[PDB]
A paper describes a structure:
[name] ([name]) regulates levels of neuroactive kynurenine pathway metabolites associated with neurodegeneration. Downregulation of [name] activity shifts the flux between the two branches of the KP toward increased KYNA formation, thus generating a neuroprotective environment. The [name] reaction is a random bi–bi mechanism proceeding through a ternary complex of [name]-bound to l-KYN and NADPH (steady-state enzymatic assays are described in Supplementary Methods) with a turnover value, kcat, of 8.2 ± 0.2 s−1 and Km values for NADPH and l-KYN of 16.9 ± 1.5 and 12.1 ± 1.4 µM, respectively. We next determined crystal structures of [name] in complex with the novel inhibitors or with l-KYN to inform the design of small-molecule inhibitors capable of penetrating the blood–brain barrier.
Compounds 9, 11–13 and 16–19 are structurally similar to the [name] inhibitor 6-(3,4-dichlorophenyl) pyrimidine-4-carboxylic acid, in which the pyrimidine ring of the reported inhibitor is replaced by an isosteric furan ring in 9, 11–13 and 16–19. To validate binding modes of the four inhibitors for which crystal structures were obtained (1, 4, 9 and 13), we investigated their mechanisms of inhibition. Consistent with the crystal structures, each compound was found to be a competitive inhibitor of l-KYN. Inhibitor 9 is also a competitive inhibitor of NADPH, whereas compounds 1, 4 and 13 were mixed type inhibitors with respect to NADPH. In each case, the inhibitor was bound in the l-KYN-binding pocket, with the chlorinated aromatic moiety occupying a similar position to the substrate l-KYN aniline group. Furthermore, the carboxylate group of the inhibitor was in close proximity to [name] R83/Y97/N368. Notably, inhibitors 1, 4, 9, 13 do not stimulate [name] reduction by NADPH in rapid mixing stopped-flow assays. H2O2 production was not detected with compound 1 and [name] using a coupling reaction with o-dianisidine and horseradish peroxidase in the presence and absence of l-Kyn. This suggests that 1, 4, 9, 13 inhibit [name] activity in the absence of H2O2 production and thus may be preferable for therapeutic application.
Numbering used by the authors: 6 to 244, 247 to 373, 381 to 455
Write the structure that this text describes.
Amino acid sequence: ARQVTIIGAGLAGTLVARLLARNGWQVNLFERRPDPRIETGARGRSINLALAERGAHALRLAGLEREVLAEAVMMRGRMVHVPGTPPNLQPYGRDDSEVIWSINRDRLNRILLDGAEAAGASIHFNLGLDSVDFARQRLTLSNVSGERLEKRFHLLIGADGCNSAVRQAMASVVDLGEHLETQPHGYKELQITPEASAQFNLEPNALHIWPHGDYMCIALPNLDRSFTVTLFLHHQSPAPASPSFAQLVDGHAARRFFQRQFPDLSPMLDSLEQDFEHHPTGKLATLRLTTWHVGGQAVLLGDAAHPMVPFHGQGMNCALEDAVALAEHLQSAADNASALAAFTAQRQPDALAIQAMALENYVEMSYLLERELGQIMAQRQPTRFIPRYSMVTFSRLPYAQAMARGQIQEQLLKFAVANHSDLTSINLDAVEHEVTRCLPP
Ligand SMILES: Cc1cc2nc3c(=O)[nH]c(=O)nc-3n(C[C@H](O)[C@H](O)[C@H](O)COP(=O)(O)OP(=O)(O)OC[C@H]3O[C@@H](n4cnc5c(N)ncnc54)[C@H](O)[C@@H]3O)c2cc1C
Ligand SMILES: O=C(O)c1ccc(-c2ccc(Cl)c(Cl)c2)o1
């Protein structure tokens, strides 16, 4: 039986472990954190993730979809909150068949862990990868107490997240062609209780957004009517008094900021002060690699291979999509080296596409006529004019194809709106003809 060692029992690592063990591979999976299925007295702090069609499809191929969706909340659209006006629901699709799902990360990881073990994988927790000796084909692991263990490996899969230790080790033996692009926004994760969201009638079956120019909040629901809230805000003010994490010296400052800038959201954040001080501020960055593998010895996938900004909510979906593709190449290739090169060749252009579209979404949420004309064109020519957040989300269309069609649609709108102040001056039938001329079904 072919042997593989996977580092990181996250979303990509656990899924690929299941797909490989199900195909007869001897799978050993190492995770630095404890087993989350072992109940302790500690609280369960976990965020919700938006699971889209492409991510759900990957779970379907793994035979885990129904189990996952049973614990997921349906989000029919985005609920945009501008103070003074009732929330405006922008539906994601025609009906409840075009939706995305909010799933708690911890729940998903536990289901994937059970699935990988049911398929025959062996999972070892409380062991973090420290280094790799590629010549001797050995790696070193250690627990938090620093006690070290050495293991032989034949194939090494780096599914160890955006700060992959496997990636660091690979960069020592090959030039991965890394380019790091940091973003000026950080983020802070907050919470809304079930009592609070009910009291203020926050729609459970929707994704919620609080736009505010250079900063904003987003909220995803959970089964118990609580919401996970994420604040996006500049790390630093430009050189000066504009809002930034540096300007919010403590949780009391955060409250004043929210009471001023997010008045309809502050009442729902009961634990704002403590969450703001105890939850660390996250960083945003995009990391692009020219290559994802070292010969036939090691390969990266998920956040280890292509860290991206969380806008568009596609990091997990891409990671699950990576896992299916990697298992497919490994299963059917002439040899591991061929599989890893073919895997890289397939997935690298798609990762670049979603990395770019996520950043574009990041910029766009940090012109009104174009979106208004586009909303009309999407209703008049379905299957040809599909909004950006729908193509990435509701179809297994390769990311690069979603992007290519998005540019055609964006330019088409540019020509129709150019040199017009309002929509009554636009020839709607002429716009529709360009759609049929430049967008195949
Ligand atoms: C605020 C925020 C919100 C997001 N919202 C969404 C969303 O709505 N929808 C979506 O699709 N994506 C979302 N994402 C992106 C998504 O969370 C990641 O892309 C996804 O988790 C990637 O899965 P992964 O398996 O590659 O990495 P991870 O899920 O991070 O798993 C990596 C695993 O490897 C472990 N590990 C790390 N280092 C080591 C080591 N040396 N040794 C052993 N184990 C190690 C870690 O403990 C972890 O278990 C969001 C990201 C952020 C920061
Ligand atoms: O419809 C959308 O544009 C959409 C779907 C999922 C997300 C999402 C989820 C979590 C975070 Cl943190 C962010 Cl920034 C965005 O956005």
